[PDB]
DNA sequence: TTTCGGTGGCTGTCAAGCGGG
DNA sequence: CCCGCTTGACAGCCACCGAAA
């Protein structure tokens, strides 16, 4: 009825732009079966996954619903890719607006898992505070709940040419 | 009009367990 | 054993909808 599902075949179909769920449907297995093969035999990681390896917090649901979480993810993606070529127009507009707001009001983002959601932060967990010098070029506040790796310092700082993109 | 938060469904990963060599 | 799967639970991702400039 077919050829047993190997990592190479899934990777080939991914290169062709198919995702793991569609591949699972193609081979009559669960997406988890497709994921296991990728996880077990070292399948390439997308930019988002790479950014995830260097994510600064132990977040849960429903933190993923806050706009700060989504915008910071988009920012990490931009710094990793280095241009907007892999982002939709919406991600670009929203990210630039977020940067402009963040820069002009001199704030950095802080995370504390005990803060409960409130109006304008539907996922809870995040809050904006004014930058002090220890923050340098970072868009984030380092606190007891932030684990920042060597790779992370590059991801969570402003781009060097940030002034040119805004006007 | 365009902008921005909130929301939902879909996507993907991990841990533990099962069955066929 | 191990290898390939599935079940269940949780975290993250991205465009659409509507109300507020």
Helix-strand layout with pairing:
Elements lengths: L6 H9 L4 H8 L3 H11 L5 H7 L13 H15 L7 H16 L2 E5 L14 E5 L19 H6 L6 H4 L2
Antiparallel strand pairs: 1-2
Helix pairs in contact: 2-3, 5-6
The chain binds a DNA duplex (21 and 21 nucleotides) through helix 3, helix 4, helix 5 and helix 6.
Structural account:
This is Immunity repressor. By secondary structure, the chain is mainly alpha-helical. It has two domains: 7-44; 50-165, no CATH class. The chain has eight helices and two strands. The protein has helices spanning 7-15, 20-27, 31-41, 47-53, 67-81, 89-104, 150-155, 162-165, and strands spanning 107-111, 126-130. Strands 1-2 form a two-stranded antiparallel ribbon. It is elongated and about 65 Å long. It binds a DNA duplex (21 and 21 nucleotides) through residues 4-5, 19-21, 29-40, 48-49, 52, 59-67, 69-70, 73, 88, 90-91, 93-94, 97-98, 119-123.
Question: What's the gist of this structure?
Answer:
This is Immunity repressor. The chain is mostly helical and 167 residues long. It has helices at 7-15, 20-27, 31-41, 47-53, 67-81, 89-104, 150-155, 162-165; strands spanning 107-111, 126-130.
Shape: elongated
The chain-level structural class is mainly alpha
Q: Oligomeric form of this entry?
A: monomer
Give the % helix: 40-55%
**Domain module count:** 2
Distinct helical segment count: 8
Gyration radius (Cα, Å) is 19 Å
Q: What is the rounded distance between the termini?
A: 58 Å
Give me the strand/helix succession.
HHHHHHEEHH
Number of strands: 2
Strand order of the largest sheet: 1-2
Q: What proportion strand?
A: 5-15%
Biggest sheet: strands, sense, closure? 2 strands, antiparallel
PDB class: gene regulation/dna
Keywords: helix-turn-helix motif, DNA binding protein
Assembly: trimeric
Entry title: Crystal Structure of a Mycobacteriophage Cluster A2 Immunity Repressor:DNA Complex
